[PDB]
RNA sequence: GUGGGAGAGGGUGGUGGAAUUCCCGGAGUAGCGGUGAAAUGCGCAGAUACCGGGAGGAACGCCGAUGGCGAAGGCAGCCACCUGGUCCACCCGUGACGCUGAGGCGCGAAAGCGUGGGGAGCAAACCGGAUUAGAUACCCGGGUAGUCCACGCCCUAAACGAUGCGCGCUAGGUCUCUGGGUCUCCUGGGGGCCGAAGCUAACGCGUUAAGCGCGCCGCCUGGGGAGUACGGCCGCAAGGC
């Protein structure tokens, strides 16, 4: 009920999860998927194939809205941070462009004792 | 005296009544400080590479000049309190180090 | 690979205002390139960061950008 | 701070004759008008303590050298005791 | 003295962007988070993810080094001001004015104390979830003091180069920071690495001495008892000498 036909897609993987969010090109999403939108619950969410399969929910989901071109951002680091790129690259949206923009500090904030 | 190099960016959509407006006020605000202006250079308008107060774009300024120390700073706070100078630095002026010479 | 001193001028290390010149001396982030890619010495790259920092403050030069093709 | 200016005018003020530099008393001269400068600092910024021990050190080695001036000569000591201002 | 130089040396005020958190709004469903697995937890009062706006605190990515500065503790965004130390060249001035230093005095990471502010993130204590034979721990979710600032105390440390300060003498080689020079190089002054002689119980040190000497200060005399007792002094206390 929007016919976007073009928009951009985040990727935000971690090490306990993957979740993909396909937006419009002005910023606002349209749909989402991730590691435990599907079957998947514990550990198995932060799989690659997890990442895979929400990746391609996701677009299946934008095709439902009506989606081709695509432009990829790509913030965070685990399994599955390349395959959910590779399953958007071969779901059948053309991929514009892909960004890696995970978001580092300038040193400002104290991490937890695990990240130390 | 020392010799200074005032950089000014302020808010680029003004026309001529509001540019000459806050161009006269930056120069009052030099006079009533004892600066000495040796030279200007007007950039104008220039692409920033981040927005600036929600603006892509930007108005530049630059004055080399020769005024007392202990009144700098004070001259720069008074510079930076109108509303559309978004960006005010005062810096000792430097000879030129060169490289690949 | 070419380092940025050895494809440049007779160039001011101490102007913040030349964006073109000092462009070069950026990553293809807004990171300050090290000096085995800039060819410098550590006088020379030490002036250069604090002129790179003068122009960022300035809005001239990006203070971070986006990775490409990753 | 203290520019050529200032600096020139102390010494020809306190030099035993033209074109001396390192006089004792010239010495003592710039010593005790870099300690007001720095003592008159350290008015404000009560918690700047690198330039006290500074401070500290340019006291020592003017009262070394007073002491000197007072082992050898009292007289011309006295002289530069009045002019300064010290002890 | 003159003339140059490098620097996270210190103090004061200003100021910039990234990120975390929170709040407002937009769009958008059903989970997010987390772990070796999990669960507490958060989510239909709309979270997580995305976009725009606002608020606040703390710390300064790349540059960055095996680097620099400082007497030590220690000191990293940028700008301005106030200020300390130091190095080099000129061979200009004074003419032994020097070295060390019991006591004294000052400084002194973190934590801790007092009064008043501040409070994002982190986080002793504490509250829960797990794990386990038990879990008072490691792991997960919360969370106060505190961490931050002003002022006044506290005087400890693996406060380490486990190497007191100063001066002279005794092969070089290599990397480096910073000056000067007639600039394959030389000559100072710092930071490393090999290694002559020599030293050392050995490891190792070796012009940055743990070598050859001189001056002065501090300290040692088997382990446990014990940095305890008593006494004194200091401290609001903790406690310190
Ligand atoms: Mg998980
Ligand atoms: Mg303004
Ligand atoms: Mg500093
Ligand atoms: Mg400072
Ligand atoms: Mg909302
Ligand atoms: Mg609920
Ligand atoms: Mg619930
Ligand atoms: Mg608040
Ligand atoms: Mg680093
Ligand atoms: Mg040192
Ligand atoms: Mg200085
Ligand atoms: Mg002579
Ligand atoms: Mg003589
Ligand atoms: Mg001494
Ligand atoms: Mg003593
Ligand atoms: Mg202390
Ligand atoms: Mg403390
Ligand atoms: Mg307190
Ligand atoms: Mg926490
Ligand atoms: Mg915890
Ligand atoms: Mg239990
Ligand atoms: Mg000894
Ligand atoms: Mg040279
Ligand atoms: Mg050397
Ligand atoms: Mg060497
Ligand atoms: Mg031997
Ligand atoms: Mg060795
Ligand atoms: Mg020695
Ligand atoms: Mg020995
Ligand atoms: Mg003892
Ligand atoms: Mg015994
Ligand atoms: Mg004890
Ligand atoms: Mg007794
Ligand atoms: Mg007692
Ligand atoms: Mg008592
Ligand atoms: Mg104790």
Same mark, same amino acid.
């Given at each position: 009920?929007?016919? $976007?036909?073009?928009?951009?897609?985040?990727?935000?993987?971690?090490?306990?999860?993957?979740?993909?969010?396909?937006?419009?090109?002005?910023?606002?999403?349209?749909?989402?998927?991730?590691?435990?939108?599907?079957?998947?619950?514990?550990?198995?969410?932060?799989?690659?194939?997890? @990442?895979?399969?929400?990746?391609?929910?996701?677009?299946?989901?934008?095709?439902?809205?009506?989606?081709?071109?695509?432009?990829?951002?790509? +913030?965070?680091?685990?399994?599955?941070?390349?395959?959910?790129?590779? @399953?958007?690259? @071969?779901?059948?949206?053309?991929?514009?462009?892909?960004?890696?923009?995970?978001? $580092?500090?300038?040193?400002?904030?104290?991490?937890?004792?695990?990240? +130390? | 005296?020392?010799?200074?190099?005032?950089?000014?960016?302020?808010?680029?959509?003004?026309?001529?009544?509001? #540019?000459? #407006?806050?161009?006269?006020?930056?120069?009052?605000?030099?006079?009533?400080?004892?600066?000495?202006?040796?030279?200007?250079?007007?950039?104008?308008?220039?692409?920033?590479?981040?927005?600036? &107060?929600?603006?892509?774009?930007?108005?530049?300024?630059?004055?080399?000049?020769?005024?007392?120390?202990?009144?700098?700073?004070?001259?720069?706070?008074? #510079?930076?309190?109108?509303?559309?100078?978004?960006?005010?630095?005062?810096?000792?002026?430097?000879?030129?180090? #060169? &490289?690949? &010479? | 690979?070419?380092?940025?001193?050895?494809?440049?001028?007779?160039?001011?290390?101490?102007?913040?205002?030349?964006?073109?010149?000092?462009?070069?001396?950026?990553?293809?982030?807004?990171?300050?390139?090290?000096?085995?890619?800039?060819?410098?010495?550590?006088?020379?790259?030490?002036?250069?960061?604090?002129?790179?920092?003068?122009?960022?403050?300035?809005?001239?030069?990006?203070?971070?950008?986006?990775?490409?093709?990753? | 701070?203290?520019?050529? !200016?200032?600096?020139?005018?102390?010494?020809?003020?306190?030099?035993?004759?033209?074109?001396?530099?390192?006089? *004792?008393?010239?010495?003592?001269?710039?010593? *005790?008008?870099?300690?007001?400068? =720095?003592?008159?600092?350290?008015?404000?910024?009560?918690?700047?303590?690198?330039?006290?021990?500074? /401070?500290?050190?340019?006291?020592?080695?003017?009262?070394?050298? /007073?002491?000197? =001036?007072?082992?050898?000569?009292? !007289?011309?000591?006295?002289?530069?005791? !009045?002019? =300064?201002?010290?002890?």
């Amino acid at each position: 009920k929007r016919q $976007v036909a073009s928009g951009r897609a985040y990727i935000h993987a971690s090490y306990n999860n993957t979740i993909v969010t396909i937006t419009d090109p002005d910023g606002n999403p349209i749909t989402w998927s991730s590691g435990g939108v599907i079957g998947y619950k514990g550990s198995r969410k932060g799989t690659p194939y997890a @990442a895979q399969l929400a990746a391609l929910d996701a677009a299946k989901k934008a095709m439902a809205y009506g989606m081709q071109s695509v432009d990829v951002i790509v +913030r965070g680091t685990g399994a599955g941070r390349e395959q959910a790129i590779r @399953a958007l690259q @071969a779901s059948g949206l053309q991929v514009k462009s892909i960004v890696d923009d995970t978001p $580092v500090p300038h040193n400002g904030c104290r991490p937890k004792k695990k990240f +130390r | 005296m020392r010799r200074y190099e005032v950089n000014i960016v302020l808010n680029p959509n003004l026309d001529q009544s509001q #540019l000459a #407006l806050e161009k006269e006020i930056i120069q009052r605000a030099l006079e009533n400080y004892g600066a000495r202006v040796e030279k200007v250079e007007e950039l104008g308008l220039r692409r920033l590479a981040y927005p600036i &107060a929600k603006d892509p774009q930007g108005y530049f300024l630059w004055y080399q000049v020769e005024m007392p120390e202990d009144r700098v700073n004070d001259l720069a706070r008074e #510079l930076r309190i109108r509303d559309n100078v978004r960006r005010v630095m005062v810096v000792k002026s430097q000879e030129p180090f #060169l &490289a690949n &010479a | 690979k070419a380092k940025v001193k050895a494809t440049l001028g007779e160039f001011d290390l101490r102007d913040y205002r030349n964006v073109e010149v000092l462009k070069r001396f950026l990553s293809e982030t807004g990171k300050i390139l090290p000096r085995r890619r800039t060819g410098l010495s550590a006088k020379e790259q030490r002036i250069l960061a604090k002129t790179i920092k003068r122009a960022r403050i300035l809005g001239l030069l990006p203070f971070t950008e986006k990775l490409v093709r990753k | 701070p203290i520019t050529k !200016e200032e600096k020139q005018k102390v010494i020809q003020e306190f030099a035993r004759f033209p074109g001396d530099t390192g006089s *004792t008393e010239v010495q003592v001269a710039l010593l *005790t008008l870099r300690i007001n400068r =720095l003592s008159e600092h350290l008015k404000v910024h009560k918690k700047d303590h690198h330039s006290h021990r500074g /401070l500290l050190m340019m006291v020592g080695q003017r009262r070394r050298l /007073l002491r000197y =001036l007072q082992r050898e000569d009292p !007289e011309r000591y006295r002289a530069l005791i !009045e002019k =300064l201002g010290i002890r």
